[PDB]
Amino acid sequence: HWGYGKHNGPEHWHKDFPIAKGERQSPVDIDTHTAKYDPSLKPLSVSYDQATSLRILNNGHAFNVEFDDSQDKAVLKGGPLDGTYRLIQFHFHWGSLDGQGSEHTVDKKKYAAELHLVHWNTKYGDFGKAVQQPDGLAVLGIFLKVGSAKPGLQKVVDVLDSIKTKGKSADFTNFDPRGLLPESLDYWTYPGSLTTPPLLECVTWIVLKEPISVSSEQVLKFRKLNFNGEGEPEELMVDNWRPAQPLKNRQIKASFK
Numbered sequence: 001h002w003g004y005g006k007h008n009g010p011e012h013w014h015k016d017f018p019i020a021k022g023e024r025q026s027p028v029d030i031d032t033h034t035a036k037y038d039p040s041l042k043p044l045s046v047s048y049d050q051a052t053s054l055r056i057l058n059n060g061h062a063f064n065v066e067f068d069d070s071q072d073k074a075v076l077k078g079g080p081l082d083g084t085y086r087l088i089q090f091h092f093h094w095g096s097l098d099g100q101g102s103e104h105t106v107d108k109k110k111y112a113a114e115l116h117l118v119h120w121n122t123k124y125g126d127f128g129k130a131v132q133q134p135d136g137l138a139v140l141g142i143f144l145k146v147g148s149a150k151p152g153l154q155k156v157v158d159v160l161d162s163i164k165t166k167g168k169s170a171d172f173t174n175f176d177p178r179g180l181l182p183e184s185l186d187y188w189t190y191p192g193s194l195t196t197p198p199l200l201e202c203v204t205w206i207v208l209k210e211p212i213s214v215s216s217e218q219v220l221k222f223r224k225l226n227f228n229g230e231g232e233p234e235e236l237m238v239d240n241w242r243p244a245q246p247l248k249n250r251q252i253k254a255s256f257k
């Protein structure tokens with residue numbers, strides 16, 4: 001199936017998913033000088049106090065921390081968003097080397113990794129019907145740079161040994177995603193897509209300007225995971241990022257002056 005190698009990576013995905021060459025694909029380069037402050041944006045509200053994590057899973061493309069989204073518990077609202085979006089999962093994209101790994105770039109700068117907190121619009125009832133809508137999803141994207149350890153990441157790093165290969169999962173209750181957020185919620189926003197197949201164009205992206213710092217040791221542990229399943233030849237899970245796609249007829253709006 002699709003992946004990130006020479007033979008099945010991003011430059012191939014359009015064959016099975018022609019929306020790969022669509023009009024509002026993600027990620028994009030954020031040209032900070034061209035992004036315009038939008039005084040029409042309402043304050044962003046990240047409300048993660050009642051978040052209920054359940055499980056961590058290696059899906060062969062990344063690992064996902066999954067949440068109970070059967071009720072309004074961890075939600076995103078405000079900023080560009082109309083109504084309430086429920087957190088369903090987070091995951092990361094990262095590099096084989098510290099100089100690459102993010103999907104969005106900032107004035108062509110690649111960070112070492114990028115976190116995506118995926119939310120769906122509760123007007124649509126569940127995630128599967130939300131991905132049939134042009135405003136079905138909101139993804140909060142957060143850059144990681146290598147520097148000081150992030151203490152609120154270490155519970156994720158420590159469980160990775162238990163989900164090394166594709167299809168492995170573990171319990172992952174009581175994890176507080178507030179520990180992954182930077183101090184500032186200044187952001188850029190634009191309409192885009194899932195960055196993995198099926199590449200659906202449902203996503204309001206909200207990309208925070210402030211990166212979080214993680215340690216070299218933390219990111220090295222991400223790079224020990226495997227794309228393959230248990231008892232298949234080992235292929236390190238690295239460079240699981242899609243490069244920037246054409247901006248087309250879109251404008252990137254800033255939340256800050």
Ligand SMILES: Oc1ccc(O)cc1
Nearest residue numbers: 118139193194195196
């Ligand atoms: O459900 C989603 C998964 C990945 C994305 O990049 C966006 C939404």
Ligand SMILES: [Zn+2]
Nearest residue numbers: 091093116195
């Ligand atoms: Zn992602």
